[PDB]
Design a protein around this motif. Structure first.
Motif, short mmCIF file in Angstrom:
data_model
loop_
_atom_site.label_atom_id
_atom_site.label_comp_id
_atom_site.label_asym_id
_atom_site.label_seq_id
_atom_site.Cartn_x
_atom_site.Cartn_y
_atom_site.Cartn_z
N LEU A 185 -7.13 36.36 7.05
CA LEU A 185 -5.69 36.36 6.83
C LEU A 185 -5.22 37.72 6.33
O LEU A 185 -4.23 38.27 6.83
CB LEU A 185 -5.28 35.25 5.86
CG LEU A 185 -5.37 33.82 6.42
CD1 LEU A 185 -5.26 32.82 5.31
CD2 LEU A 185 -4.29 33.58 7.46
N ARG A 186 -5.95 38.24 5.36
CA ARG A 186 -5.54 39.54 4.78
C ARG A 186 -5.44 40.63 5.86
O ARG A 186 -4.49 41.36 5.84
CB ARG A 186 -6.33 39.85 3.51
CG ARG A 186 -5.40 40.38 2.42
CD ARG A 186 -5.92 40.34 1.02
NE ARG A 186 -5.58 39.17 0.25
CZ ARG A 186 -6.07 38.95 -0.95
NH1 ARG A 186 -6.88 39.83 -1.50
NH2 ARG A 186 -5.72 37.89 -1.63
N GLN A 187 -6.39 40.69 6.78
CA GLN A 187 -6.37 41.70 7.83
C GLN A 187 -5.24 41.45 8.81
O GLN A 187 -4.68 42.41 9.36
CB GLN A 187 -7.71 41.76 8.59
CG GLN A 187 -8.97 41.83 7.70
CD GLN A 187 -9.22 43.22 7.07
OE1 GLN A 187 -9.96 44.05 7.62
NE2 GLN A 187 -8.61 43.46 5.91
N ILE A 188 -4.92 40.18 9.06
CA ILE A 188 -3.80 39.85 9.94
C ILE A 188 -2.50 40.41 9.37
O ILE A 188 -1.71 41.03 10.09
CB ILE A 188 -3.73 38.33 10.15
CG1 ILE A 188 -4.93 37.88 10.97
CG2 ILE A 188 -2.42 37.93 10.82
CD1 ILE A 188 -4.77 38.14 12.45
N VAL A 189 -2.30 40.25 8.06
CA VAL A 189 -1.10 40.77 7.40
C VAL A 189 -1.02 42.29 7.53
O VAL A 189 0.05 42.85 7.81
CB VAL A 189 -1.05 40.33 5.92
CG1 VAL A 189 0.32 40.55 5.37
CG2 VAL A 189 -1.44 38.88 5.77
#
Ligand code: BRL
Ligand code: OLA
Length: 258
Positions: free
Chosen positions: A226-230
């Motif tokens: 999720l963090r990398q998607i953001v």
């Protein structure tokens, strides 16, 4: 005691149902063919896109699609905000920290629940009345054609976990309760809540998925996806701020983006 944790699980599930009109269980019944729900209209090209408005109630097309995601994230933020307030102890935390947990939690949550609306071939839209194919989205022009692809990639991996809504309600709460968000004033009361949510999640996954080994561990590992998607998404927003200076981001959204 497990009993206290099961009651927290029930509570969170109950607020989840009340704050999110399109649950994963409804999304799933629409996407598969169940008779509880009705089939979506499918947008796979620009001409069926234009027929979508004469059936569903919804300036070049890639832009107008993008304004559609904008409007939907604003709505999701409103729903997530409503759900946060139901998490015990959240509204008693310092008001600055409340803003800070939401500010950083909201997108990781959006992409988590967006997976509920996705299969490998596309995404439900307009409260499940529509279905926009992955390929039509990937064929949009220069900057827009690749804003969804990473979300599809995450959703395919995340959907393999087979979480249902009662699982997600607790997991969503753990995300919002992250004491490691930059700028938090009193990390310790946040962590005490998250530790209680994590206990509730762990028990919930064990009872709901007794045969799925280490699902708890594999679910938390998903938090780096999720963090990398953001991060990719905000770098993609910085490209569009400059190449279309005639386009407006919704203020609730640009405040979240610092
Ligand atoms: C593709 N869909 C479903 C929504 O799928 C989403 C895609 C991206 C986001 C993040 C947004 S995108 C943006 O501009 N800033 C944000 O925070 C949120 C939702 C459409 C498309 C057209 C109309 C309505 N729905
Ligand atoms: C939880 C992830 C947030 C995005 C949900 C996907 C919504 C798809 C597009 C919706 C258009 C916005 C207008 C209101 C419709 C809600 C759509 C839906 O939930 O399917």
């Amino acid at each position: 005691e497990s009993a206290d944790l099961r009651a927290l699980a029930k509570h969170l599930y109950d607020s989840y149902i009340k704050s999110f009109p399109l649950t994963k269980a409804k999304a799933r019944a629409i996407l598969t063919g169940k008779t509880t729900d009705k089939s979506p209209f499918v947008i796979y090209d620009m001409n069926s896109l234009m027929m979508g408005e004469d059936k569903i109630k919804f300036k070049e097309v890639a832009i107008r699609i993008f304004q559609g995601c904008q409007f939907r994230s604003v709505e999701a933020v409103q729903e997530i905000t409503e759900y946060a307030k139901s998490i015990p102890g959240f509204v008693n935390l310092d008001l600055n920290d409340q803003v800070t947990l939401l500010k950083y939690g909201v997108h990781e949550i959006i992409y988590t629940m967006l997976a509920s609306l996705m299969n490998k071939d596309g995404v439900l839209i307009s409260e499940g009345q529509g279905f926009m194919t992955r390929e039509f989205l990937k064929s949009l022009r220069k900057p827009f054609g690749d804003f969804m692809e990473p979300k599809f990639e995450f959703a395919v991996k995340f959907n393999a976990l087979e979480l249902d809504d009662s699982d997600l309600a607790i997991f969503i709460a753990v995300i919002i309760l992250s004491g490691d968000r930059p700028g938090l004033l009193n990390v310790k009361p946040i962590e005490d809540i998250q530790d209680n949510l994590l206990q509730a999640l762990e028990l919930q996954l064990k009872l709901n998925h007794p045969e799925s080994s280490q699902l708890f561990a594999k679910l938390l590992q998903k938090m780096t996806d999720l963090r990398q998607i953001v991060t990719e998404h905000v770098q993609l927003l910085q490209v569009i701020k400059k190449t279309e200076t005639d386009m407006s981001l919704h203020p609730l959204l640009q405040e979240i983006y610092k």
